[PDB]
């Protein structure tokens, strides 16, 4: 209730009550006004939090380490065009299959919780998670780290979304910067460090 | 470091892992069992039938 709100002193929507991790009462348009869409959208925000987190790691870390002389990674922007040990198309096809397997099973768990967590081949490999979107198990919790008391996971999960939100902005940061500036993200950092009051969007 | 041991709830689980590994002999051992000496045992049956 008295949890911090995005807009202090405003009245948060009723369907947001602070239970979920990262609920700062932010939903002006009420996309999660009804419970069901909220449930789906919770997943939507969750996975988007993880992909960008790798993408932020995928863009910034190599470009940083190649800006200094340690490695050779090219720009993420033209990363797709590069020619690797085979054609791009088949790798994308191979990516279509394998991801579709996890994006298939994950789909089953979403529409029907708890009906997917046992290994189809070696049935003693059952997964341990109970919350939808938190698979648990030895593959995805090699030491646990998710099986704890509340007010800790709520802290931890909020430490998972609040970072993910930080990623999704950053990668779209690297997105638009590469388009209307001619260089990588780190250059856009440095040219902003030499003359902070001059070198900005306003060139 | 028994009186104000903070992370005993977590640390022991690490124990519950590490020992569970060493007693399992570095699971790679069980791998050759459930693959090789159970693969040839079926291959002989197949080449018999």
């Amino acid at each position: 209730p008295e949890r911090p709100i995005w807009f202090p002193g405003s009245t948060p929507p009723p369907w947001l009550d602070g239970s979920l991790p990262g609920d700062f009462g932010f939903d002006p348009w009420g996309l999660g006004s009804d419970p069901e869409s909220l449930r789906w959208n919770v997943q939507a925000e969750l996975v988007h939090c993880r992909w960008a987190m790798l993408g932020a790691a995928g863009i910034f870390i190599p470009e940083l380490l190649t800006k200094i002389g340690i490695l050779n990674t090219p720009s993420w922007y033209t990363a797709g065009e590069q020619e690797y040990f085979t054609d791009t198309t088949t790798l994308f096809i191979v990516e279509l299959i394998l991801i579709g397997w996890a994006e298939g099973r994950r789909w089953a768990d979403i529409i029907k919780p708890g009906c997917v967590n046992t290994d189809p081949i070696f049935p003693n490999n059952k997964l341990t998670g109970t919350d939808v979107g938190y698979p648990g198990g030895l593959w995805f919790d090699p030491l646990g780290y998710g099986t704890g008391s509340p007010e800790k996971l709520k802290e931890l999960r909020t430490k998972e979304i609040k970072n993910g939100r930080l990623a999704m902005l950053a990668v779209m940061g690297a997105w638009f910067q590469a388009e209307y500036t001619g260089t990588g993200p780190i250059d856009n950092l440095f040219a902003h460090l030499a003359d902070p009051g001059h070198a900005t969007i306003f060139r | 470091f028994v009186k104000r041991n903070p992370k005993k709830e977590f640390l022991d689980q690490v124990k519950k892992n590490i020992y569970s590994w060493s007693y399992n002999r570095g699971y790679i051992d069980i791998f050759y069992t459930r693959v090789f000496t159970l693969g040839i045992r079926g291959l002989t049956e197949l080449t018999e039938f």
Binding site: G30, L31, G32, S33, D34, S37 | -
Partner: protein, 42 residues
Amino acid sequence: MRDIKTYLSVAPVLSTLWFGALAGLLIEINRLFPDALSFPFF
């Protein structure tokens, strides 16, 4: 949220969405296989 989906499901709104998709599909096919006076596959 429910009321928005219901409105989007009323007949006219589906029609433009459905036909619009249909128009896009046919235009694409004619862009890739133009003139198309016969069906010369078999």
